[PDB]
Amino acid sequence: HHWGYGKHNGPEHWHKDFPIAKGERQSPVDIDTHTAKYDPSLKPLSVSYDQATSLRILNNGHAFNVEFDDSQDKAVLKGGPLDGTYRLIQFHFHWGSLDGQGSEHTVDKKKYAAELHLVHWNTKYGDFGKAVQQPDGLAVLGIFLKVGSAKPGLQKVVDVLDSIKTKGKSADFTNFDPRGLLPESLDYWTYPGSLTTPPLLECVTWIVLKEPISVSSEQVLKFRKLNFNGEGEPEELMVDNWRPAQPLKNRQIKASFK
Numbered sequence: 001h002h003w004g005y006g007k008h009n010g011p012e013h014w015h016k017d018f019p020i021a022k023g024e025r026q027s028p029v030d031i032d033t034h035t036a037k038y039d040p041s042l043k044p045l046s047v048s049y050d051q052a053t054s055l056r057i058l059n060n061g062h063a064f065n066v067e068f069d070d071s072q073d074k075a076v077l078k079g080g081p082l083d084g085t086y087r088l089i090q091f092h093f094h095w096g097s098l099d100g101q102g103s104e105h106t107v108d109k110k111k112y113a114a115e116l117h118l119v120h121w122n123t124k125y126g127d128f129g130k131a132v133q134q135p136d137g138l139a140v141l142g143i144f145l146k147v148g149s150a151k152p153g154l155q156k157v158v159d160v161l162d163s164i165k166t167k168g169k170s171a172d173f174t175n176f177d178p179r180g181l182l183p184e185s186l187d188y189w190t191y192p193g194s195l196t197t198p199p200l201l202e203c204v205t206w207i208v209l210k211e212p213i214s215v216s217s218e219q220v221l222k223f224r225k226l227n228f229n230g231e232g233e234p235e236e237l238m239v240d241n242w243r244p245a246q247p248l249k250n251r252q253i254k255a256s257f258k
């Protein structure tokens, strides 16, 4: 009986195995655009993905992760609100059963069709596993998806999904360029929070872009053909794998833009 999103094991149940679920800096949150303060000391985000090396894509039974070789100083995130340099390790999405829901963060309560998380760990902690143990260990760059025009840079990911339909399947996934998934503007909101899945650790500086990317209805439909179950188990479509907004508690959301 471990965690998931279904009835019986979804987000309102996670606190029983992961008490930090009701902690002081949980994610996601609703971004109240009128209350976020412009912070003229924030820097432009620096996203250096030219040398990114993807390795593999994996259906882990919650989502699919596109995994990177993070053994050298390649795909990094810095600047913005960050001190130091954070290294890309994987990306994944959260999406809905319908286009009216799916994102984890919301903007003035607006839910987008999906949300992309590019996960980076602080190189001062030497690896991902040690980083998640620190309050400034991770930087996750969150990008909203709306349904409209297709995102050509997404299509390679969409096409490999029928090879990892079920939990525990993986596939070779090299030379995937994540610059294809970024909107034009890097205007962002930022606040301190957590992993949005168990173990829900409070180790994340969240950077959420204001500009969504557009993906097609056929693209997001293919996400929804994935399965939560393993091969040879009864089919449970992989939909609604998002955690709802959690209490903001004392925290400030800062905006990089006027």
Ligand SMILES: NS(=O)(=O)c1ccc(CCNc2ncnc(Cl)c2[N+](=O)[O-])cc1
Pocket (backbone or CB within 6 Å): 117, 119, 129, 132, 140, 194, 195, 196, 197, 198, 199, 201, 204
């Ligand atoms: N949705 S999100 O906030 O962007 C996000 C959620 C979860 C993760 C990592 C979850 N995996 C782990 N987390 C913590 N410790 C270990 Cl040791 C692992 N682990 O798997 O070995 C990364 C990002």
Ligand SMILES: [Zn+2]
Pocket (backbone or CB within 6 Å): 092, 093, 094, 117, 196
């Ligand atoms: Zn995520």
